From a paper:
Cohesin is composed of two rod-shaped SMC proteins, [name] and [name], with a dimerisation interface at one end that is connected to an ABC-like ATPase domain via a 50-nm-long coiled coil. Interaction via their dimerisation domains produces a V-shaped [name]/3 heterodimer whose two arms are connected by a central ‘hinge’ domain. The ATPase domains of all SMC proteins are separated from their hinge dimerisation domains by 50-nm-long coiled coils, which have been observed to zip up along their entire length and fold around an elbow, thereby greatly shortening the distance between hinges and ATPase heads.
The other is an aspartic acid on the surface of [name]’s hinge domain that is replaced by an aromatic residue: smc1D588Y. Smc1D588 is located in the hinge domain, at the C-terminal end of a β strand that interacts in an antiparallel fashion with a strand in [name]. Despite its proximity to the [name]-[name] interface, D588 does not appear to contact [name] residues. To determine whether the smc1D588Y mutation alters the hinge structure, we introduced the equivalent mutation ([name]) into an isolated mouse hinge. Importantly, the change had little or no impact on the overall structure of the hinge. Y574 adopting the same conformation of D574 crashes with a neighbouring loop (right, [name]). This revealed that the amount of Smc1D588Y associated with [name] hinges declined more rapidly in the presence of a WT competitor than WT [name], indicating that Smc1D588Y at least increases the off rate.
Residue numbers in the entry:
A (entry chain A): 493 to 673
B (entry chain B): 493 to 683
Write the structure that this text describes.
């Protein structure tokens, strides 16, 4: 059952108590797609990083994993904001017609969450349709990572992925988190 | 039988596998797109083998990428997906297209402390780019402390035999990992 969900929530509250101002929450707790029409694309690009736990430092991440291991809790991914190796967003890509930067369609509240979004989004772009997304991603010897509104993703590696119905259901989490507040 | 493997897989994951077979069957009923079936080579986990000392770290490294679909081309990939979504089928599907995969070599540091995961897998050389994509970036390291150093200094993910992960960008993953039979072991029995 959803005991898995309640149990990760207990672990999370425990480690928040253990390392008070060091564990911020899951990425899904800390940002939101700016408009409804982009929620599926944001959901697809973020992927499993929606549930990554954002922390300050590598030591916090290591201590948290050690706690989880001792308690026999399920594995978690920790993104230490101040240790992640990220490059600034390539703003020239805003000039590509038919495409927006995915990170431009996410808002986030503590300014330092920008670093987790740079990690998770990089220079991914969102396009209106599958044909637009494929042309911009594969059209050049310099490929791009693009995602259409239905969640079909084209990666620089040449990987292609999707599943529109599953992604629609996953994106319902965003409005639930907004309610929660 | 082979349903033991299915029970270990998770219905969200099986959904994409069943749906892909729905698309293929549909193409077969209409006598169209035989190149799609001929270019569909199955999932990653069905196309490699490794020694059991590596089951945990290989399986943790792949995660759901064990269920990525090796296919001939981006053509095969997009035709399946366009129909997949047309029919509003459940699941997610990811394709490794052999004609489009673009993989980057990186500098393995030669050390007893860390060895390439890729050279521990046995697979058909025709799928090399698919297996290099999933596994070519990860080293198997002797300890979390070595993992911490090598993943920081180089462009390789590090994982211990027990499954602790350090990404080459700083992402740390770990927790309690069962002694249950690996998905890889259950697949080994049906092969």
């Amino acid at each position: 059952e959803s005991s898995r969900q309640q149990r990760k929530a207990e672990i999370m509250e425990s480690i928040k108590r253990l390392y008070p101002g060091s564990v911020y929450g899951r990425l899904i707790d800390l940002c939101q797609p700016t408009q409804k029409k982009y929620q599926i694309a944001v959901t697809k690009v973020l992927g499993k990083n929606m549930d990554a736990i954002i922390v300050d430092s590598e030591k916090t991440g290591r201590d948290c994993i050690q706690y989880i291991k001792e308690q026999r809790g399920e594995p978690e991914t920790f993104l230490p904001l101040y240790y992640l190796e990220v490059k600034p967003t390539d703003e020239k890509l805003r000039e590509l017609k038919g495409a927006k930067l995915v990170i431009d369609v996410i808002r986030y509240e503590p300014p330092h969450i920008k670093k987790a979004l740079q990690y998770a989004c990089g220079n991914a772009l969102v396009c209106d349709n599958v044909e637009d997304a494929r042309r911009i991603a594969f059209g050049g010897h310099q490929r791009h990572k693009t995602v259409a509104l239905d969640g079909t993703l084209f990666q620089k590696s040449g990987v292609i992925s999707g599943g529109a119905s599953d992604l629609k259901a996953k994106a319902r989490r965003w409005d639930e988190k907004a309610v929660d507040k | 039988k082979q349903q033991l493997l299915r029970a270990a897989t998770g219905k969200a994951i099986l959904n994409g596998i069943d749906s892909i077979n729905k698309v293929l069957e549909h193409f077969r009923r209409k006598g169209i797109n035989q190149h799609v079936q001929n270019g569909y080579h199955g999932i990653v986990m069905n196309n490699f083998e490794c020694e059991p000392a590596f089951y945990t770290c290989v399986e943790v490294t792949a995660g759901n990428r064990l269920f990525y679909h090796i296919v001939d081309s981006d053509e095969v990939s997009t035709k399946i997906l366009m129909e997949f979504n047309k029919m509003n089928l459940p699941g997610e599907v990811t394709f490794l297209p052999l004609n489009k995969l673009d993989v980057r070599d990186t500098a393995y540091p030669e050390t007893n402390d860390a060895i390439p995961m890729i050279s521990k897998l046995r697979y058909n050389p025709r799928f090399d780019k698919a297996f290099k994509h999933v596994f070519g970036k990860t080293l198997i390291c002797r300890s979390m402390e070595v993992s911490t150093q090598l993943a920081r200094a180089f462009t390789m993910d590090c994982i211990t035999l027990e499954g602790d992960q350090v990404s080459h960008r700083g992402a740390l993953t770990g927790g309690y990992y069962d002694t249950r039979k690996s998905r890889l072991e259950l697949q080994k029995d049906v092969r």
